[PDB]
Amino acid sequence: SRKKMGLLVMAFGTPYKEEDIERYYTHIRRGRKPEPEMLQDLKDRYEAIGGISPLAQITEQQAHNLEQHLNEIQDEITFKAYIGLKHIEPFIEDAVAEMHKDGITEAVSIVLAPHFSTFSVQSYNKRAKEEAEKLGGLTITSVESWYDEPKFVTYWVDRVKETYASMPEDERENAMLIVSAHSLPEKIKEFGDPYPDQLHESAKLIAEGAGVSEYAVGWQSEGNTPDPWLGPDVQDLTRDLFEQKGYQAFVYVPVGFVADHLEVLYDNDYECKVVTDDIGASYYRPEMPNAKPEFIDALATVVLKKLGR
Numbered sequence: 001s002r003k004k005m006g007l008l009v010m011a012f013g014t015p016y017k018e019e020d021i022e023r024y025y026t027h028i029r030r031g032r033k034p035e036p037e038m039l040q041d042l043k044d045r046y047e048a049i050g051g052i053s054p055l056a057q058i059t060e061q062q063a064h065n066l067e068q069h070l071n072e073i074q075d076e077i078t079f080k081a082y083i084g085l086k087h088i089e090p091f092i093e094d095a096v097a098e099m100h101k102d103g104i105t106e107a108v109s110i111v112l113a114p115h116f117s118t119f120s121v122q123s124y125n126k127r128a129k130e131e132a133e134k135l136g137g138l139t140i141t142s143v144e145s146w147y148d149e150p151k152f153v154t155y156w157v158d159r160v161k162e163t164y165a166s167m168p169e170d171e172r173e174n175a176m177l178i179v180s181a182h183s184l185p186e187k188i189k190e191f192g193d194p195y196p197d198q199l200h201e202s203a204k205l206i207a208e209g210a211g212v213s214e215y216a217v218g219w220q221s222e223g224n225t226p227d228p229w230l231g232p233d234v235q236d237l238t239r240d241l242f243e244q245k246g247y248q249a250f251v252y253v254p255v256g257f258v259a260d261h262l263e264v265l266y267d268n269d270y271e272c273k274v275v276t277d278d279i280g281a282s283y284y285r286p287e288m289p290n291a292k293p294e295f296i297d298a299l300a301t302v303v304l305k306k307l308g309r
């Protein structure tokens with residue numbers, strides 16, 4: 001009685017082992033293979049954050065955990081996950097092709113990044129749909145943003161209430177909450193990209209639901225190019241908020257991210273820690289959602305509401 005549907009889970013991507021990093025960034029660097037020293041730098045970071053192997057695994061887990069969950073909270077449709085990544089195989093265009101080969105004719109996709117942006121999400125979705133049209137007999141309904149999904153906010157609000165709840169009285173009262181997402185070229189502004197607004201909105205929600213009056217919005221992991229990117233970067237903002245109001249603690253909630261990426265384990269737990277430590281403040285960073293039930297559930301609702309279920 002169930003209708004067979006495709007569940008296209010998309011994401012930036014992650015190398016599966018040390019030996020894939022070169023090609024991985026090249027693709028990110030748009031055909032520009034990293035210099036030997038930058039290459040050995042990248043390996044070290046990955047080596048530093050506990051290794052690469054666990055990284056990709058988190059995505060497979062989120063995909064198959066969302067698939068099974070969706071399949072038991074409703075009985076009308078039966079989903080079959082298909083991962084499509086941007087900078088590494090399986091690429092989006094293959095994920096869409098395999099689905100086809102499998103007789104899937106009706107699919108609903110979602111990108112593992114709560115916020116919308118023309119640079120990433122729109123790109124992923126348009127690519128997923130174009131590959132389809134090319135093949136034919138295959139339609140995809142794409143989610144664009146879910147950062148506002150109540151269950152996704154509740155997730156972050158509690159991790160925050162937990163973190164401030166564990167703070168020494170001393171700290172609780174002189175702490176700053178920094179909500180952030182992956183920085184993107186400023187130029188995205190001439191298209192009216194809502195990316196920056198939405199992130200500010202994720203801050204407002206989480207801070208509000210958590211009862212935190214003081215907070216700020218930042219950006220991070222910006223790439224290198226002539227044209228300006230979104231600021232202020234988390235490092236400067238931290239140090240800036242400190243020299244202006246000497247906070248004793250900073251709680252980093254990289255809401256733009258959904259898992260234990262390099263962007264979070266090194267750019268937040270290291271780079272930002274380096275600033276908190278330098279200025280004498282305590283570093284705090286709640287668990288990422290990863291593949292936890294509370295997250296997958298939220299993700300489910302996002303997918304079902306998209307389908308009117």
Ligand SMILES: [Zn+2]
Pocket residue numbers: 182221222223
């Ligand atoms: Zn990046």
